[PDB]
A and B are shown apart, each in its own frame.
Chain A
Amino acid sequence: AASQAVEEMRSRVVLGEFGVRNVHTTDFPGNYSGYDDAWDQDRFEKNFRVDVVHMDENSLEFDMVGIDAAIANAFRRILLAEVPTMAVEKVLVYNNTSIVQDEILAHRLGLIPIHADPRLFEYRNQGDEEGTEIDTLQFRLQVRCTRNPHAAKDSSDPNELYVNHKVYTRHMTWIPLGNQADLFPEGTIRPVHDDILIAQLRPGQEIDLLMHCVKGIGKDHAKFSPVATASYRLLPDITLLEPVEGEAAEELSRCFSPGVIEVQEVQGKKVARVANPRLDTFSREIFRNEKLKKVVRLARVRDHYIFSVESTGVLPPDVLVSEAIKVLMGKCRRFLDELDAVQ
């Protein structure tokens, strides 16, 4: 019949052996004769829901049900390249005497994430390289390598011959500017990670420099992005057309990831059941097995997105997602105000 064919065509993305099918979106007025697709606000608000499935520090996974790709992808792009953070931008160096070149060293220092809150600082105006307390931060790095006076005669372990032969990111000292010393309590402004190796020295060599930190967005330079990686994927839903019994049940369970399929005893014989389809990676290995190609159907739900945001440590991920949502409101508000002004 046409009814179920059209329903599957308009609500499921079908994974075939050689290519995906029904990739596009077709819920617009006039495309299907029997239905109506004009925007209905109440119908959207009735069906939308969000499920938080897991969360801990520097991680977050949650679901959006009822939203469409044209919007979820906007949130993803905003997360990648429009949420602002703080990154070193200028390096004032005097007496660099290491092996690392100045340009390479400055580039390396650029990529170290900082633990300031970017919502309390303004964009630095063009020029005015000096900056001020409202739109900049300052750090100072200064380490000199010397021979250890108490070294034994082994003269073989670098960790004992020399002292401060390795420059870590914990040697950077925050230099308060203006009244920042009062607003930010001790310990809040610091590099996030504290383990990152910056360079490596030998006795007699010295590094001594100052660096200025300003505000930016990831669209400009990839060092400003607050997200390790943000992505999403559609919820899988596997369905098997006919019951599978016996060793074929084990075969089916083996053609998938460990968790999704489960085998159980009902009367003394093994019955297969699709238990937890969230966990499939779609290796599409069932199409190797000739007999089972005809008894399963692979598809994905179109209006169910599984997000996975993992932050880099500047802010907790939920705050990042909130800011990402607010940016789009900002854009459309900007254009509305512009349009009213021109009219």
Chain B
Amino acid sequence: MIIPVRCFTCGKIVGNKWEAYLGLLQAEYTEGDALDALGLKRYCCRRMLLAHVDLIEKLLNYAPLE
């Protein structure tokens, strides 16, 4: 649904990387260059952002609102 705070395997904080990752992708980067720019080295951490699906954006469109 929403980005997890910490990488499962090693415990690094990745919860604050989502907006920056999307911004760097928006700048015509590639995923490799973006992930290296954010500083995620161990491949146990790169999959935490490279394989995420953001369902909360789609779910909130069905949520009640005024």
Contacts and interface: CB of A to CB of B under 8 A. Distances in A.
Contacts of A225: 11
A23 interface: no
A262 B40 CA distance: 29
Q: How many residues of A sit at the interface, in one of the four size bands?
A: 20 to 34
Nearest to A229: B10
B53 interface: no
Given A99-B63, A204-B66, A229-B11, A199 B2 contact: yes
Interface residues of B, number: 21
Interface string A101-136: 000000010011100000000000000000000000
B66 A113 contact: no
A196 interface: yes
Contacts, number: 53
Secondary structure at chain B's binding surface: helix, strand, loop or mixed?
Answer: loop
Contacts of A205: 63, 65
A197 B1 CA distance: 13
A279 interface: no
A195 B18 CA distance: 10
Interface string B53-65: 0001001100111
Contacts of A175: none
Interface string A190-217: 0001011101101111000000000000
13 contacts: A99-B1, A99-B56, A111-B5, A111-B6, A112-B5, A195-B16, A197-B3, A197-B19, A205-B65, A225-B11, A228-B10, A228-B12, A229-B10
Given A99-B63, A312-B13, 15 more contacts: A100-B1, A111-B5, A193-B16, A196-B15, A197-B16, A200-B2, A200-B56, A202-B60, A203-B66, A204-B65, A204-B66, A225-B11, A228-B12, A229-B11, A229-B42
Interface of B: 1-3, 5-6, 10-13, 15-16, 18-19, 42, 56, 59-60, 63-66
